[PDB]
Amino acid sequence: DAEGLALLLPPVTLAALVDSWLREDCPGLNYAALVSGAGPSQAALWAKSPGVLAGQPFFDAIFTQLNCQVSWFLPEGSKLVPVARVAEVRGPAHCLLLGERVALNTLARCSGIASAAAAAVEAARGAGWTGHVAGTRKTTPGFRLVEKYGLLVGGAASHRYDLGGLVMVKDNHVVAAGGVEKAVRAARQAADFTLKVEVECSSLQEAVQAAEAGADLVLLDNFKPEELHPTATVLKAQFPSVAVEASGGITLDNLPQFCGPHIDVISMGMLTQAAPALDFSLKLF
């Protein structure tokens, strides 16, 4: 259930995020506040786009800072069928109007990402695939928390949250260490026993070498589907312990061709780099 995902959020990081957003939007005097005054008011939140609602905790934390309350008519994760009345916000008029843009901006993006994740999860399910659709570290700097949380709301896995969550050996590591085996052995020796090591591999030879040197996960990078499945099949046969991830150029359109019985995870840069924001408005009534 998506309603439970809010529990994941670090509250100290949340509060600081919210403050820095409001500071960004209004660092000094807000002259518009005299236009609206402090009279108690109510505003309706409208969804004008189809997709998945995500970002309630952030929307709430923005408005709570500004002494406003929110009532949701749809739970976190609901399908959105425009034009829908999603929520009501109450508080002093200038407070509502001060938070409006930042709150809509957050909900729009979080919902945009959750929508793209859900479409990808749906296409995979429709192709018979049971594994994890996942995001990447291709997130807007400073805004990871919202973006990874959006992915989760959409039913995708977030993948490692940051550099501290998993040790990922990539092409650049392989080059710097002087070869796949040296890179993986160094990664394995260096990584705390609590961490997994994943290795980005551009061929089957690399993947085998990586599995032999102790990789927990092998990421098959930029394979055409026709070489991908035979590669994953062998790896799973020779190394059934190793998880297999596919990534590189995977889109909502081609995703079903990348699904296969020997792929455990499919990760997509597009879920965060190319998810258009949903359209929401907040109309004072």
Add this chain to the structure above:
Amino acid sequence: DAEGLALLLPPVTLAALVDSWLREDCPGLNYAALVSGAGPSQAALWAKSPGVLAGQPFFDAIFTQLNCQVSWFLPEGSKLVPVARVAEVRGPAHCLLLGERVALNTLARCSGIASAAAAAVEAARGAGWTGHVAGTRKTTPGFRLVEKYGLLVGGAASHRYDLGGLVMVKDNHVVAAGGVEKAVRAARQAADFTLKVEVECSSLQEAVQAAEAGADLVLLDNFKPEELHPTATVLKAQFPSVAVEASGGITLDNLPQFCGPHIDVISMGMLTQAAPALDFSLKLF
């Protein structure tokens, strides 16, 4: 000229921004650094998407913090023809690898935005229009600086940077003040004489009321082009002092329809909410 735009950037805000992005990506121990080591290294930056290059100052600031140096082979604002060698980065291997994803993320989004901005400016120029294409406050919270700067690099105007740069009376302010004239009179009385007042108007009646009560700018919100131009024409005839801005549902496709001799400014949420990130990579060699 785009190479000069870096001078606009508040350096204190920049350095803090860069810190907070690196803190977001790696808050604790970075075990991968043992895989690469500290040996001096070089990496090529590759452009794999068409569009406009934007974000050099951010990319530089990230790598300078990490004791790396960057050489650009393309000036800020260049057209990108993939696959193009854009830059070279140099530093200790683990520093390069630490900054890579955050640097590419920033460059990708900034460039994505600038690209969409230039496409919009090109379509307007091609429909004979001389005014400003502009952005909005529909930006990713915490990342406005990069986004507004991207718009500038693409030849669009940024529009007000935040709530302190202009007083904008919107449908919500109109509702709260109890009507157009009350809202605008309160905005004008409240705003420091150094500020302009702009008024969002959904009809010609509103626009006239707003001009009469002293608006510097009138924004015609969500007009079909057929109603937009007659409205603008009347407004400019009666109130030649008043600048006219069009906004609402304007896309790269329909933009030429919204250009007209009496529109001074066209603003587009899509330039920031729906600009896909460009594809860059940073390959150690």
Add this chain to the structure above:
Amino acid sequence: DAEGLALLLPPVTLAALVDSWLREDCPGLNYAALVSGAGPSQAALWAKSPGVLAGQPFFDAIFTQLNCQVSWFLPEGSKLVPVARVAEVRGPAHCLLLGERVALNTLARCSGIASAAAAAVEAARGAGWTGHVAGTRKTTPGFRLVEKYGLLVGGAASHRYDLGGLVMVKDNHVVAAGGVEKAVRAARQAADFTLKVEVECSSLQEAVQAAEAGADLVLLDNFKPEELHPTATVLKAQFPSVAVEASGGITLDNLPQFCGPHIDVISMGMLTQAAPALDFSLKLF
């Protein structure tokens, strides 16, 4: 009207300000707390200086942070006739005594500035002048928010809040650009369309060049009143669109000589650089 001015204040910036002032005054252990104890207490706030009361929202925020409550016997902006009971503060004794000095310091300076502002407004009104008395950027660093707010409470305009609110071309910009016309044309081309451009001019020739190149405001800097008024008169006659501001060595004493029918704004460094703080005390009873 002054009771409504509190609405202008950015709440995130206010909270961090207050934190940082209390940190500055007591970074570590506060041994004096043990002398007072945590017994609920009450203190009276005394105004011992004539002038205008300003700064209630800062005084309140300091005490709220420290779990104390304040009741005002006088609204924000009231004339102060010493010795007057202005407020009651309640909370744990050690909390009251911890906040005392910072709260009095803030109210003293805010009130000092508001008083100088009101005296200036009064002297202008008495000389028949209708325009804006305004402050400058000559503010104590880190304290601008309290100083600009003080101005407003005293009836003066704040002028631009910071470098983002207006583009102001000064003698140094003229030098760096190579001449008045090049500076103004560069300012106009650079500034977002939402911003005004104001140009500091030391002669009537400069003012005409600035008005011709597109200035919204011309600031006549350091004129003796005898040269100022003819200059303003000409300017208004040729360029009735252009607002005219006088500034430089304007004091409460000479201010009536600087008022004239063709001056729109008079700005005074003294309102923030040389306003003595009012005398307040907070006596536990």
Add this chain to the structure above:
Amino acid sequence: AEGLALLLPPVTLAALVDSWLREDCPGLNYAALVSGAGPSQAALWAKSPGVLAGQPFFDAIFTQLNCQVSWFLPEGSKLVPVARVAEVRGPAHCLLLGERVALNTLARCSGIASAAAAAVEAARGAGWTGHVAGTRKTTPGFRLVEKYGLLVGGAASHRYDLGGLVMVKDNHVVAAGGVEKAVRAARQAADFTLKVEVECSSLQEAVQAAEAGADLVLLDNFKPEELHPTATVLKAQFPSVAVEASGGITLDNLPQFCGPHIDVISMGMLTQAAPALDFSLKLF
């Protein structure tokens, strides 16, 4: 005065400077395009008499913005207007970005140093050897500059904050239920490394405070005719106890408050009513 810069906590200085620059320009700076990045030079002019103070702040502001400063007058010099005080060099837009915050800081620091030197001069002129001191009546957020200014003027800063000295005031006396209870509580609570000072509005109080173990007694709001007899008796009975006078002391009445039994005279006016000096920065 040239050595006083050493006192400054560098971590606190850097953060101060950042927050001042952030305050003055949080977002895009369009004016930078008007000046460009060409190397430039600007002269610092002193247009007010008084004492120069605040070099380390001015330097720190300009170093952040990749500019350099050369001083023609050392910290603490007497200013005779119109004087060429310094030269600043760097990219034009950097100079102009730092200008106003740097002038604002030097103006206020110098203002305070000037009032402090005037007060030190008037005291010396009246034969007094004691310490002229400031108070905690400082602009919030700007104490570091203000206390430093006092020192450049030759005044003592007094306790820097609540953690440097335990000061028992009228309010503490009321809350504790009397002078003796307040002072005994202050003395028991304060770490042995700290002094205890007690604000006393009468001789009876001062005697009680001294008897209860005060290191300093601050005679608050005495008219000078009652002040000196009071200090005299105190010094005679309790020669260990330093005596400070404070309350309504001004540059004008200060010589009346000097006496052989006052050790310290503190003045709110040195920080609450010191006008800022006039400086400008002219690009040339």
Add this chain to the structure above:
Amino acid sequence: AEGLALLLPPVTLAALVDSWLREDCPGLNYAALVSGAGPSQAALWAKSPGVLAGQPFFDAIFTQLNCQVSWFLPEGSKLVPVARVAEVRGPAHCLLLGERVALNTLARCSGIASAAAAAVEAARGAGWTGHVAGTRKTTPGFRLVEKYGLLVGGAASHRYDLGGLVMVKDNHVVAAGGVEKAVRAARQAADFTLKVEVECSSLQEAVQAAEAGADLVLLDNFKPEELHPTATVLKAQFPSVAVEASGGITLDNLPQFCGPHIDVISMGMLTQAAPALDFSLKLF
């Protein structure tokens, strides 16, 4: 000890708590889904002997996380294991989020307070009335908890930081060119509200330091046989000067350093080598 909480600067406290929680969980907390948000209650167990200290920190951690705490023992109580000390309440995932950081803080605060109480007790048992004290030998970033723990245990904290007292050390002596130059420079530089203490490794230095106007003289690394004759002479000729002993003082040798002419005994061990107490927080 119940009143010591009032000493704590609330702004510094809140920021401390935030940074501890950020340190322990900067990103997503997947464990939260295992416990859920149902209301819950946990018992706090003391498994070590010693002195309980750190309640205000433990409370601030849990208050931030919307949990409440009830204490069954007041701050400063003797702990006899295994004792039920407190109950915590709140949403399950909030309790479990706070648990480790809260226990970490109480464990260390209590560890320090226990060592301090042991040291005060051994001194009292050897007839000594002076102050047992800490040093600046604290964990960086964690000074507030460590100094507060010292207080709860009955030791003095000593100067909180570099701003509380001016301390001339070996290294100042070398840099200034000798004891007298160092102490005269310290005295001239220090605001009149501050004391000056001087670290001395011989009687010669102690006398010189007293003569130059030191308020306190710290006899560093003396064997007890040389310490007491030195302190005796110092008190005889300079009764105004407080005498502190420090260096290699342990719980074991402490009684040999107590003497009628020692005012303060400071021990690095109270903070450098105090084992944390064992506490657990068991959901029931």
Add this chain to the structure above:
Amino acid sequence: DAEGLALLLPPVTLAALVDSWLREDCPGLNYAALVSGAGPSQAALWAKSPGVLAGQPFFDAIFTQLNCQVSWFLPEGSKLVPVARVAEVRGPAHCLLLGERVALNTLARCSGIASAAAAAVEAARGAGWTGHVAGTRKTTPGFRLVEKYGLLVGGAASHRYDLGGLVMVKDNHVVAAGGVEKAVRAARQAADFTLKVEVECSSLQEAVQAAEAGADLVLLDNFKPEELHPTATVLKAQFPSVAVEASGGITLDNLPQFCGPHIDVISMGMLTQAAPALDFSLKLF
């Protein structure tokens, strides 16, 4: 290899740490600086305790901020035989004396922890045991980075760095979930696929349940050694995939009794909670 471990450190978090330490030790004026002056000076760093040298990167960062340089005569991780000359520090006198205590405090605690870790690793090696000696999250709040680093320099594994690095089900999670199986199934479902799940088990029955429900690691908590090894033996025989950790009341003295062939990891709170600081001094010469 200890000299390489410095690369693990996140540079942004490091710099912020160092700042906050210096701010804690001297928030306002430092009158002692006038006693030393600014003359260039040198100081020798002396080790007066046996054990292992750890913390150079911290010590260097402190001094670099204060414009001092450090030369090490012993590499990071060296055995310390007192009284040894470990390093030389150079810079202006007042800068050296400002950083001295905080630098010593850091080096002292880091080295203390590294010494305890190395003593533990030695005793294990001496009892024939090959597995990882590890720390815990029982670290001084705010100072984890230095403490986990110290562990690594002494040859111990750090264990998970924070709550983000691994999902650890403890007795409390078990009670809150309503049983071992429900807790582990919830942990696995909730944890991103990139994370491992470890389960604290106080009996063999729980350990079996945890392994069956999908635990990657089982932590045998508070076993007497006589019950431990037979439990581990059974567990390894039925679940060879599952790593086994022992923990609870393990000390340097009893550690060899806890080593065994079916234990992979032994973690010890004492390494961080009861490690006395080493004695170092810095003597200006």
